[PDB]
Scaffold this active site. Structure first.
Site, PDB file in Angstrom:
ATOM      1  N   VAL A 263       0.821  -1.207   0.000  1.00  0.00           N
ATOM      2  CA  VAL A 263       0.000   0.000   0.000  1.00  0.00           C
ATOM      3  C   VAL A 263       0.859   1.262   0.000  1.00  0.00           C
ATOM      4  O   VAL A 263       0.647   2.172  -0.809  1.00  0.00           O
ATOM      5  CB  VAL A 263      -0.987   0.007   1.190  1.00  0.00           C
ATOM      6  CG1 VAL A 263      -1.697   1.347   1.281  1.00  0.00           C
ATOM      7  CG2 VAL A 263      -1.990  -1.121   1.052  1.00  0.00           C
ATOM      8  N   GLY A 264       1.828   1.339   0.901  1.00  0.00           N
ATOM      9  CA  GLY A 264       2.662   2.518   0.968  1.00  0.00           C
ATOM     10  C   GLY A 264       3.819   2.342   1.923  1.00  0.00           C
ATOM     11  O   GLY A 264       4.155   1.226   2.324  1.00  0.00           O
ATOM     12  N   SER A 265       4.430   3.470   2.278  1.00  0.00           N
ATOM     13  CA  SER A 265       5.562   3.475   3.198  1.00  0.00           C
ATOM     14  C   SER A 265       5.596   4.760   4.018  1.00  0.00           C
ATOM     15  O   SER A 265       5.238   4.766   5.196  1.00  0.00           O
ATOM     16  CB  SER A 265       6.875   3.302   2.433  1.00  0.00           C
ATOM     17  OG  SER A 265       6.927   2.043   1.789  1.00  0.00           O
TER      18      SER A 265
ATOM     19  N   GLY B   9       8.042   2.968   8.399  1.00  0.00           N
ATOM     20  CA  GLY B   9       7.380   1.682   8.274  1.00  0.00           C
ATOM     21  C   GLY B   9       6.754   1.444   6.912  1.00  0.00           C
ATOM     22  O   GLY B   9       6.608   2.370   6.115  1.00  0.00           O
ATOM     23  N   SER B  10       6.385   0.193   6.647  1.00  0.00           N
ATOM     24  CA  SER B  10       5.751  -0.204   5.397  1.00  0.00           C
ATOM     25  C   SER B  10       4.400  -0.842   5.692  1.00  0.00           C
ATOM     26  O   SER B  10       4.256  -1.587   6.666  1.00  0.00           O
ATOM     27  CB  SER B  10       6.634  -1.180   4.615  1.00  0.00           C
ATOM     28  OG  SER B  10       6.024  -1.545   3.390  1.00  0.00           O
ATOM     29  N   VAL B  11       3.415  -0.554   4.843  1.00  0.00           N
ATOM     30  CA  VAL B  11       2.037  -0.986   5.045  1.00  0.00           C
ATOM     31  C   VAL B  11       1.645  -1.946   3.930  1.00  0.00           C
ATOM     32  O   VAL B  11       2.008  -1.744   2.765  1.00  0.00           O
ATOM     33  CB  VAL B  11       1.070   0.216   5.095  1.00  0.00           C
ATOM     34  CG1 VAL B  11      -0.360  -0.249   5.328  1.00  0.00           C
ATOM     35  CG2 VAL B  11       1.493   1.200   6.176  1.00  0.00           C
TER      36      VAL B  11
ATOM     37  N   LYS C  56       1.048  -3.025   9.093  1.00  0.00           N
ATOM     38  CA  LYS C  56       2.198  -2.131   9.062  1.00  0.00           C
ATOM     39  C   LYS C  56       3.379  -2.817   9.735  1.00  0.00           C
ATOM     40  O   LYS C  56       3.316  -3.150  10.923  1.00  0.00           O
ATOM     41  CB  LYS C  56       1.889  -0.800   9.749  1.00  0.00           C
ATOM     42  CG  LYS C  56       3.009   0.232   9.631  1.00  0.00           C
ATOM     43  CD  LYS C  56       2.518   1.639   9.965  1.00  0.00           C
ATOM     44  CE  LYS C  56       2.666   1.966  11.444  1.00  0.00           C
ATOM     45  NZ  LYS C  56       3.958   2.653  11.746  1.00  0.00           N
TER      46      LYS C  56
ATOM     47  N   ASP D 211      -2.098   8.620  12.418  1.00  0.00           N
ATOM     48  CA  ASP D 211      -0.861   9.406  12.356  1.00  0.00           C
ATOM     49  C   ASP D 211       0.099   8.681  11.412  1.00  0.00           C
ATOM     50  O   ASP D 211       0.997   7.958  11.847  1.00  0.00           O
ATOM     51  CB  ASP D 211      -0.264   9.605  13.751  1.00  0.00           C
ATOM     52  CG  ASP D 211       0.654  10.817  13.833  1.00  0.00           C
ATOM     53  OD1 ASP D 211       1.237  11.201  12.797  1.00  0.00           O
ATOM     54  OD2 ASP D 211       0.792  11.385  14.940  1.00  0.00           O
TER      55      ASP D 211
HETATM   56  C1  LIG Z   1       5.524   7.337  16.556  1.00  0.00           C
HETATM   57  C2  LIG Z   1       4.139   7.324  16.421  1.00  0.00           C
HETATM   58  C3  LIG Z   1       3.329   7.461  17.540  1.00  0.00           C
HETATM   59  C4  LIG Z   1       1.947   7.450  17.402  1.00  0.00           C
HETATM   60  C5  LIG Z   1       1.358   7.294  16.152  1.00  0.00           C
HETATM   61  N1  LIG Z   1       0.022   7.292  16.057  1.00  0.00           N
HETATM   62  N2  LIG Z   1      -0.697   8.069  16.664  1.00  0.00           N
HETATM   63  C6  LIG Z   1      -1.967   7.820  16.362  1.00  0.00           C
HETATM   64  C7  LIG Z   1      -3.151   8.602  16.940  1.00  0.00           C
HETATM   65  C8  LIG Z   1      -2.628   9.896  17.568  1.00  0.00           C
HETATM   66  C9  LIG Z   1      -4.153   8.939  15.837  1.00  0.00           C
HETATM   67  C10 LIG Z   1      -3.840   7.758  18.010  1.00  0.00           C
HETATM   68  C11 LIG Z   1      -2.037   6.806  15.510  1.00  0.00           C
HETATM   69  C12 LIG Z   1      -0.759   6.489  15.318  1.00  0.00           C
HETATM   70  N3  LIG Z   1      -0.297   5.503  14.541  1.00  0.00           N
HETATM   71  C13 LIG Z   1      -0.769   5.310  13.295  1.00  0.00           C
HETATM   72  O1  LIG Z   1      -1.652   6.015  12.806  1.00  0.00           O
HETATM   73  N4  LIG Z   1      -0.205   4.284  12.627  1.00  0.00           N
HETATM   74  C14 LIG Z   1      -0.568   3.972  11.380  1.00  0.00           C
HETATM   75  C15 LIG Z   1      -0.601   4.884  10.325  1.00  0.00           C
HETATM   76  C16 LIG Z   1      -0.978   4.461   9.056  1.00  0.00           C
HETATM   77  C17 LIG Z   1      -1.303   3.124   8.855  1.00  0.00           C
HETATM   78  O2  LIG Z   1      -1.677   2.625   7.646  1.00  0.00           O
HETATM   79  C18 LIG Z   1      -2.102   3.667   6.761  1.00  0.00           C
HETATM   80  C19 LIG Z   1      -2.830   3.049   5.564  1.00  0.00           C
HETATM   81  N5  LIG Z   1      -4.289   3.031   5.759  1.00  0.00           N
HETATM   82  C20 LIG Z   1      -4.666   2.225   6.930  1.00  0.00           C
HETATM   83  C21 LIG Z   1      -6.175   2.240   7.115  1.00  0.00           C
HETATM   84  O3  LIG Z   1      -6.785   2.941   6.014  1.00  0.00           O
HETATM   85  C22 LIG Z   1      -6.423   2.344   4.757  1.00  0.00           C
HETATM   86  C23 LIG Z   1      -4.921   2.444   4.568  1.00  0.00           C
HETATM   87  C24 LIG Z   1      -1.257   2.210   9.901  1.00  0.00           C
HETATM   88  C25 LIG Z   1      -1.584   0.878   9.680  1.00  0.00           C
HETATM   89  C26 LIG Z   1      -1.535  -0.029  10.734  1.00  0.00           C
HETATM   90  C27 LIG Z   1      -1.162   0.394  12.005  1.00  0.00           C
HETATM   91  C28 LIG Z   1      -0.836   1.729  12.223  1.00  0.00           C
HETATM   92  C29 LIG Z   1      -0.882   2.635  11.169  1.00  0.00           C
HETATM   93  C30 LIG Z   1       2.176   7.163  15.032  1.00  0.00           C
HETATM   94  C31 LIG Z   1       3.560   7.175  15.165  1.00  0.00           C
END
Ligand SMILES: Cc1ccc(-n2nc(C(C)(C)C)cc2NC(=O)Nc2ccc(OCCN3CCOCC3)c3ccccc23)cc1
Ligand SMILES: Nc1ccc2c(NCc3cc(CC4CC4)co3)nc(-c3ccccc3)nc2c1
Length: 332
Positions: free
Chosen positions: A25-27, A28-30, A45, A160
């Protein structure tokens, strides 16, 4: 659980048998996959070098702790977290599993035109999620369309994962070190304004050009705000800019809902002490079609004491391993 292996765009994946049909899907890597245990399309991810440094290790622990705590309809949750390791000695990969959303708000705003009804529902879900996040003493700091996932039924989730500075609160641009949670509210105003006009509100080329665009709309800071600025450097640079008058937002967001213009007037305020909060904004008349105080929950209290701790890499790695083992999946 038995694992299998395959290479997908330079990165090799070891996932349990329940996840099938992995697709990058994209880029960690998803990767997008199908969960045979739940029947859901999921996003997996894989964290890239989770413990390469103290910075990476603590970042890994922070993200896993955050995702395990988020249990809200408008915030991304954790369906599963796994590792191919059988013990702490061989623990080097971390995988995060969540729902697969249709797209992000960045694709929708540039490929479709949104009715005022769609803006109400989309902004309401952001503020509903922000109230939950802010109630856990957590600030997003990175709210922008590419961090908001939307389904085909306009159901929105905050995540995020388009310049970030376009949606950054001005107190972040000037590097104020005591800002509050309403820095996210400023981002919501910039997003809401973009959904109403199709244009980016503050397309600044740099940090200085960003503030010049902001001041052309909100005007020169007043005497009340100037009293509360501690940095003499910033306080002098503000008093060096020519006095710009505050534009009336009805003359900027023409043809927009009068309640939408009033809410933006309460969000895009320089004085963060007077900026509207997520809870107050949910009670605004603009969301009268969706507002329900009994269905806007807050979060369980969240322990951030680890952020003030200085530990070794293997200590952060061991703490992350404990959170991987202690994870309990949500029921269907
Ligand atoms: C260091 C760090 C600390 C905290 C975060 N952080 N903070 C939040 C809050 C604040 C919103 C709760 C959320 C996150 N982390 C994320 O939002 N992480 C992610 C981003 C994009 C993703 O996949 C995107 C692709 N998408 C997934 C679903 O929709 C379709 C495709 C992910 C896929 C699987 C797991 C985590 C993902 C992030 C980094
Ligand atoms: N009590 C408060 C309330 C609001 C503050 C604040 N608000 C954001 C802001 C906006 C602006 C406008 C600049 C574009 C010209 C300057 O500061 N900044 C700052 C600030 C900015 C730079 C350095 C230190 C503090 N402090 C604030 C203290």
């Amino acid at each position: 659980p038995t694992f299998y292996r395959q290479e997908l765009n330079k990165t090799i994946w070891e996932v349990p048998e329940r996840y099938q049909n992995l697709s990058p899907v994209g880029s960690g890597s998803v990767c997008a996959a199908f969960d045979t245990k739940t029947g859901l399309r999921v996003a997996v991810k894989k964290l890239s070098r989770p413990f390469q440094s103290i910075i990476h290790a603590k970042r890994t622990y922070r993200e896993l702790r955050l995702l395990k705590h988020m249990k809200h309809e408008n915030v991304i949750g954790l369906l599963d977290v796994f590792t191919p390791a059988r013990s702490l000695e061989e623990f080097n990969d971390v995988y995060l599993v969540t729902h697969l959303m249709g797209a992000d708000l960045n694709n929708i705003v540039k490929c479709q035109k949104l009715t005022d009804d769609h803006v109400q529902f989309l902004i309401y879900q952001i503020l509903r999620g922000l109230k939950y996040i802010h109630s856990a003493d957590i600030i997003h700091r990175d709210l922008k369309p590419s961090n908001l996932a939307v389904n085909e039924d306009c159901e929105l989730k905050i995540l995020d994962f388009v310049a970030t500075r376009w949606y950054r609160a001005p107190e972040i641009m000037l590097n104020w070190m005591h800002y509050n949670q309403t820095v996210d509210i400023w981002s919501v105003g910039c997003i809401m304004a973009e959904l109403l006009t199709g244009r980016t509100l503050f397309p600044g080329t740099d940090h200085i050009d960003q503030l010049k665009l902001i001041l052309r709309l909100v005007g020169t800071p007043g005497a009340e705000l100037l009293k509360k600025i501690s940095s003499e450097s910033a306080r002098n640079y503000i008093q060096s800019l020519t006095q710009m008058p505050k534009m009336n937002f009805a003359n900027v967001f023409i043809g927009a809902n009068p309640l939408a213009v009033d809410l933006l007037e309460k969000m895009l305020v320089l004085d963060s002490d007077k900026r509207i909060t997520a809870a107050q904004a949910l009670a605004h008349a603009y969301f009268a079609q969706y507002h329900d105080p009994d269905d806007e929950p807050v979060a369980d209290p969240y322990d951030q004491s680890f952020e003030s701790r200085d530990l070794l890499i293997d200590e952060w790695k061991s703490l992350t391993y404990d959170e991987v083992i202690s994870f309990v999946p949500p029921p269907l």
